[PDB]
Amino acid sequence: MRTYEDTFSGQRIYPGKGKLYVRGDSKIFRFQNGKSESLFLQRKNPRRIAWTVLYRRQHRKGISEEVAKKRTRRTIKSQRAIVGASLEVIKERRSMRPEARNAARLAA
Amino acid sequence: MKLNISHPANGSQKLIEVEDERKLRHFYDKRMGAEVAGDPLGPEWKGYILRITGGNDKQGFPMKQGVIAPNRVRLLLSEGHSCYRPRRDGERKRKSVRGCIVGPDLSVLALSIVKQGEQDIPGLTDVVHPKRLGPKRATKIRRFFSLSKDDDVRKYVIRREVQPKGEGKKPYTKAPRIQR
RNA sequence: GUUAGUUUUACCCUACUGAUGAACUCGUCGCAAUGGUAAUUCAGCUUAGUACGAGAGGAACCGCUGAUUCAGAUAAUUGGUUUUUGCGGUUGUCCGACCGGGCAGUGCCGCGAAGCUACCAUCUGCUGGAUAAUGGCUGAACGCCUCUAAGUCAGAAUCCAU
RNA sequence: AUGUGCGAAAGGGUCCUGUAAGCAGUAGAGUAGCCUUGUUGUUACGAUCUGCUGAGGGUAAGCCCUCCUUCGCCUAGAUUU
RNA sequence: AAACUGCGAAUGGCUCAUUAAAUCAGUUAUCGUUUAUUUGAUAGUUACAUGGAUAACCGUGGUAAUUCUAGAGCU
RNA sequence: UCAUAAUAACUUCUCGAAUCGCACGGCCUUGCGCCGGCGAUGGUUCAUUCAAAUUUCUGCCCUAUCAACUUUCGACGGCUGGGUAUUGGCCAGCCGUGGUGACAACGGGUAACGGAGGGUUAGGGCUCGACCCCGGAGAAGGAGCCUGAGAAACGGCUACUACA
């Protein structure tokens, strides 16, 4: 047992109810009552029928919004050691006292 | 249904097999790039939050970000798109890709760790891998070591060692030929 | 040989289908004399490429599952019906305009619950006794033989009952 | 014939239709005036659109519930064995 | 080697289906237009050197299937 | 109304070198200072070359049992614009009523790509030309488009029809 949804209006369908329609181009449509299929075979647009589920979501009735953009931008973490130099090598070299650097310029 | 877990911080990756569906129930109906809690996976996953990055369909098609559907759709992929590699200038080919809404149909998920938990993972967060290459441009070398305007950027470049096959000679050193 | 040409009456008696009812106080729960009587046929699987035959060809009993014609009920679902004049759309004219209404014997159109209803929809349709044809048992008349002469066994969509 | 009574209203549930009247809008193809000539300058007309609005209307006449919503009625009159 | 970037792939080769002022031939015009490349000239308005990505690569995967491709880490 | 020059302004607005290789030189205030040669690759405008697209004049077989044709929804011309690398009824509005024909229009046939040329000869002619050179068109039938100086390309892409 399972339930289906009306193609035209979105109402819930329980076993034994509604109909099943197969068109010439091998497309399958399901209906829940006589109101849906009578409107479908009349070439009506479901987006202009006020009580359909598809119409309601287009006009955003009963639904709210959420924003989480700037929260993700904060994702930053630490660093690791390159194959050439282990982690102890990099920070020792960056933290060399300026006196050694002054000696390097004069020596060179 | 397999899981592809990656750790960007430690540079480690792992693949796990999950066969029990109620643990994967909380993953359904989520979107690619969303935030999820890893608690239902197991006791060892407490305190973990994961990011959904991508997946593959049962037939093998991948998910494409920006298309909202649980099924798969045909698209006219031009140059610069994700899952297309053109063979000729200006070529456009029609292909089929699977939507960005997670569902039971997919075969593999890909996800990464955002925040570490109290417990450790036996084969994922207990090991680290080193980087491959150091910086090569002149200005990037100076910023990396926080050198001043005139600090002889030549001397501070990273150089590794390599040895010949069986010559018995000493190994030598390799350097990246600073540019700019 | 060919073409066109008025088809009257039932309220009476009986018969038939149903419906009330006087007398012995008013009621509730029961027995069953007599009258009526109902089911029908096919196909598929298996038995089996078996029995039979040189070959070509080619069956049947049980078992299982469906279908045709008929009969009695029912409306959860699907279809039909619309005076629910229930809600909506629209033409003409009338109430000064808006709102709300009249008329066009139900102005017209879309959907339409309730009720009724269709092998156009769903459910259900029993087994005892006695026998005819025929095949038999013991056994004379006729020292043999024989289903019959006395007695007796099986037995049909038949007959009588449930 | 004092009762889980009967009747008339009301509230809730369930259904059918498909978004009421009224007010407001930097919505609206455009048109006609007046000025200090505007970044919406204002005054007038305008099928339609948007908000309050899955709203409004109908619902037993052979639909359901209510001792815990309200107001009424009642141990007869006549004939016969 | 690989890979990014630049250029070529619009030349050659084949055929005669359509086509009756159409194609085509000889002869004019572009004061009515575009032009890679080649050739010759030609442009006075932090600076001792600016900023972020990506391929190759390592490593982890999906589909029976293709010169299909995913997510993670360097330059 | 050409070349060129001057003035008032304008622009999601350009270009005017943050590139590479050989040589090892010359000055004095001797500072890890200044100057200096030849090439590679780019770059704005004009000229040239290979071109390309349109365009003037004249010239094609048989047929009247094909004699009138063109303008529904441009057929001939005027004007203001739109679009194109540019001219143009190429296209959009408004306004005129025109254009071809017995000196063969229009239509039907072609076992028809055009030409340089082949075969046969007193002279005049008759007939053939798919095919090595020049021009045009096509990649099974139709349409649409990207990149690029150049394509309506098919040993490039998208869709339908027919095969597979």
- What is the rounded CA–CA span in Å between residue A34 and residue A47? 19
From the CA of A56 to the C1' of F70: give the distance in Å: 60
Taking the C-alpha atoms of residue B121 and residue B12, their distance in angstroms, rounded to an integer, is 11
Helix (H) or strand (E) holding B143: helix B138-145
Sign of CA dihedral B16, B20, B24, B28: positive
Alpha-helix residue ranges (DSSP H) falling in chain A: 34-40, 53-58, 69-72, 87-94, 98-107
The SS3 of residue B37 is strand
Question: Residues near A8 by Cβ (< 8 Å), separated by ≥ 6?
Answer: A29, A31, A36, A37, A39, A40, A46, A52
Which chain B residue has the Cα nearest residue A102? B151
Written as six digits, the tokens of B86 are: 């053109």
For the CA atoms of B110, B113, B114, B116, what is the dihedral angle to 10 degrees? 170
User: Which residue among A82, A93, A105 sits closest to B145, beta carbon to beta carbon?
Assistant: A93
Beta strands in chain B (DSSP E): 2-7, 12-17, 35-37, 49-56, 72-77, 93-98, 108-115, 160-162, 172-174
DSSP class of A63: -
**CB B124 within 8 Å of CB B4:** no
Q: Does A82 touch chain B (CB under 8 A)?
A: yes
* B35, B130, B145 member nearest A80 (Cβ): B130
Resolution of the experimentally solved model in angstroms: 3.1
Q: Are A94 and B145 in contact (CB under 8 A)?
A: yes
CA distances from B31 to A41, B24, B27 (A): 36, 14, 9
State whether the Cα torsion B11-B39-B41-B71 is positive or negative.
Answer: negative
